[PDB]
Write a protein that binds this ligand. Structure first.
Ligand SMILES: CCCCCCSC[C@H](NC(=O)CC[C@H]([NH3+])C(=O)O)C(=O)NCC(=O)O
Ligand SMILES: CCCCCCSC[C@H](NC(=O)CC[C@H]([NH3+])C(=O)O)C(=O)NCC(=O)O
Lengths: 208, 208
């Protein structure tokens, strides 16, 4: 196949890209590497890291650049400049939350999980609840009736946070409904069921 | 008057945006706020954070989204899909280095500065030295002859690292020369010399 996505055998940074491809029914090689095999191939990647998307003869690293490239190719980058900017801004906010999440996961899970759930996460989710409402009253997708790459990133971030704290979206009905809407899309429903059956690790250290 | 960039009175995340605006002769209000004034206006921003670009009636937060929007608007976004993807990838790499840099600056300057300079920074710069060479043999700008938004980000990242370690580019001829080339652009030369004579801090904690 012409698309190949190389990453570790976890959800991590690649999962929104996987979700984009699965939902759009773009067939790809999901190339999942063992942690010990990475050293021998790391020099092949431009910053020594994954994920990497091979798109025909093009080798593209950096998850955000991969997503935006696919978005342009498949018309999921908004319909005008303002929409393009908005989904970019939204998606960058999602990345900020993921940074806070991964710092807690990898550096301080045993002591910072509880405080993160109680004192950090609610205020961060509230920013998205308010933002999501700006188009289509937040009752469909980030841009309203048309899907964009930012929807896959937000879906994943809400999903991993619900694993972490099953009740984190209780006070956020728009985010809760958005999450379920995205999970109900036929190709994602099937994919997420298989992902759960295999208990795919969210992170590289087994914590979630 | 049609642009206002609101950020703290440091270089930080805003500086590549300032550099883009100045060098492209885009007039803007450089709205540099005091740290104690931010608490009172925090809720006006979509993620409670700066920088913010007011572009006419549009309010755009997230430094990467801001710079990508300006690049589209002023045709500094590459001339085809591969170029646009490439500069995105390159610029995201620059941001990754900045994350390493700021973590050290804000969380462990006294214990981690020397190990950063000796044992992290050189391998990170080597990645950029190799990558720079893929277009124009890396002997002009990131895309070869045409400037792009990524050039401003690479320039600022190289400059702040040269403040940290004056000798860091000695053994990277392409990056060294790129830095020389960018600093000699007349609008940047004027702006940067005024900034540095005014002792504008790189970071918010007085370390650099
Ligand atoms: C234990 C595996 C799980 C770690 C989770 C972090 S994502 C993997 C990490 N890659 C990155 O940090 C990529 C960051 C880049 N900014 C992006 O968004 O793609 C990597 O290749 N790191 C491997 C390495 O540097 O050796
Ligand atoms: C305090 C001076 C030093 C600031 C250095 C960090 S940048 C300022 C910080 N903003 C961000 O971290 C924005 C990150 C965002 N991902 C972006 O790229 O714009 C902020 O508004 N923080 C203020 C806050 O959260 O209250």
């Amino acid at each position: 196949m012409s698309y190949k996505l190389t990453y570790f055998s976890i959800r991590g940074l690649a999962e929104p890209i996987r979700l984009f491809l699965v939902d759009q029914d773009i067939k790809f090689i999901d190339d999942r590497i063992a942690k010990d095999d990475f050293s021998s191939i790391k020099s092949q990647f431009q910053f020594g890291q994954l994920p990497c998307l091979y798109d025909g003869d093009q080798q593209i690293v950096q998850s955000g650049a991969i997503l935006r490239h696919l978005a342009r190719k498949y018309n999921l980058n908004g319909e005008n400049e303002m929409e393009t900017t908005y989904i970019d801004m939204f998606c960058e906010g999602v990345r900020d939350l993921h940074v806070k999440y991964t710092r807690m996961i990898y550096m301080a899970y045993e002591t910072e999980k509880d405080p993160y759930i109680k004192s950090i996460l609610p205020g961060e989710l509230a920013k998205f609840e308010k933002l999501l409402a700006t188009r289509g009253n937040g009752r469909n997708l980030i841009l309203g009736d048309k899907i964009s790459y930012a929807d896959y990133a937000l879906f994943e971030e809400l999903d991993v946070h619900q694993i972490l704290d099953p009740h984190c979206l209780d006070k956020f009905p728009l985010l809760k409904v958005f999450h379920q809407r995205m999970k109900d899309r036929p190709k994602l429903k099937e994919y997420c069921e298989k992902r759960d059956a295999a208990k795919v690790p969210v992170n590289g250290n087994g914590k979630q």
